[PDB]
Amino acid sequence: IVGGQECKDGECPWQALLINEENEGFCGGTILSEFYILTAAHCLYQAKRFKVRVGDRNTEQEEGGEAVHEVEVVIKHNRFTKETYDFDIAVLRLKTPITFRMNVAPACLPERDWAESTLMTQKTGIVSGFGRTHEKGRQSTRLKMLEVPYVDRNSCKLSSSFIITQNMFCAGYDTKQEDACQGDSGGPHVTRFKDTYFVTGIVSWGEGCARKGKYGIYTKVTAFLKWIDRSMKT
Amino acid sequence: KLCSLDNGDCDQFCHEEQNSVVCSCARGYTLADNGKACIPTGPYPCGKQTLE
Numbered sequence: 001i002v003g004g005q006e007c008k009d010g011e012c013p014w015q016a017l018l019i020n021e022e023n024e025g026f027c028g029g030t031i032l033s034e035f036y037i038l039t040a041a042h043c044l045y046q047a048k049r050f051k052v053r054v055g056d057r058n059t060e061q062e063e064g065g066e067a068v069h070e071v072e073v074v075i076k077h078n079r080f081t082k083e084t085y086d087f088d089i090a091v092l093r094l095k096t097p098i099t100f101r102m103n104v105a106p107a108c109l110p111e112r113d114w115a116e117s118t119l120m121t122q123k124t125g126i127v128s129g130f131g132r133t134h135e136k137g138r139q140s141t142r143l144k145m146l147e148v149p150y151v152d153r154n155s156c157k158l159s160s161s162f163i164i165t166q167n168m169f170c171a172g173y174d175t176k177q178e179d180a181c182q183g184d185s186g187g188p189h190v191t192r193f194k195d196t197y198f199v200t201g202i203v204s205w206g207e208g209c210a211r212k213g214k215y216g217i218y219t220k221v222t223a224f225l226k227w228i229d230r231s232m233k234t
Numbered sequence: 235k236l237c238s239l240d241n242g243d244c245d246q247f248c249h250e251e252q253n254s255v256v257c258s259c260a261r262g263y264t265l266a267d268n269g270k271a272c273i274p275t276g277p278y279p280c281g282k283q284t285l286e
């Protein structure tokens with residue numbers, strides 16, 4: 001995340017960190033339940049073999065409530081390609097279930113129409129991650145978060161030099177230099193409704209980070225609730 | 235106005251069935267007797283920050 005605030009104790013409990021063999025965070029993820037992690041499909045190319053870290057907020061220092069989980073099954077959406085960046089969604093089933101505690105809890109999965117009429121219509125969402133603090137820089141050691149305004153659908157299409165499909169959505173700032181960045185991919189985009197946090201997006205991509213006139217593109221979770229539900233049945 | 239008027243007083247999910255408001259909850263919550271609020275069945279229900 002470029003700009004924004006740090007995640008304080010128990011503020012971003014649904015955050016997951018994808019860690020390669022070298023034990024370094026490359027992508028984010030969302031805790032849906034004890035066995036499942038929601039991530040971006042493209043993140044699966046960023047590392048040969050990977051694990052899932054939870055309850056982590058500072059990489060350099062062990063948090064005791066921090067836990068490493070191996071992946072049993074990787075459920076990738078076959079419709080995904082680097083040419084379109086469409087259907088940028090994957091589900092990970094874990095070998096061991098997550099212990100829910102302070103900093104470790106799942107984000108709610110909303111119902112389709114309600115999510116569309118009541119969540120996507122709120123002014124902002126919150127994006128979070130261990131990604132780059134500047135467009136040119138290294139992976140963050142601290143978990144950050146940033147409130148992002150939901151961006152108007154046609155205004156989003158206009159800002160992009162690429163095709164913004166119906167599975168994608170814009171959130172961010174036209175002038176304010178704060179947005180998600182490289183390494184935040186697969187991470188959560190939640191919308192708070194009455195003190196409860198529902199999962200709305202998966203950090204997908206952007207043209208640089210916090211670039212004026214450009215936004216962060218996320219996978220529209222509502223477009224995949226049945227596919228997500230079916231994934232958890234397998 | 236139903237669901238469009240303040241989420242039909244539902245804590246979470248709002249639906250319209252036979253021109254009335256019908257509320258439901260995410261997994262890990264039970265609908266209250268008032269048919270509006272969502273009660274967590276156990277600790278750490280989804281979408282709650284762990285601030286305590």
Ligand SMILES: O=C1c2c(c(C(F)(F)F)nn2-c2cccc(-c3n[nH]c(=O)[nH]3)c2)CCN1c1ccc(-c2ccccc2CN2CCCC2)cc1
Nearest residue numbers: 083084085135162179180181182205206208209210215216
């Ligand atoms: O997504 C990123 C990206 C880059 C960097 C950087 F600069 F750090 F290297 N970070 N980053 C990133 C990563 C994560 C979040 C944010 C973010 N969220 N919010 C915000 O502002 N940024 C930024 C480089 C560009 N890229 C990208 C650009 C464009 C597509 C795309 C888009 C549509 C179709 C096909 C394609 C794929 N095609 C494109 C041409 C060949 C393949 C893919 C990737």
Ligand code: NA
Nearest residue numbers: 058061062063
């Ligand atoms: Na840590």
Ligand code: NA
Nearest residue numbers: 173210211214
């Ligand atoms: Na911007």
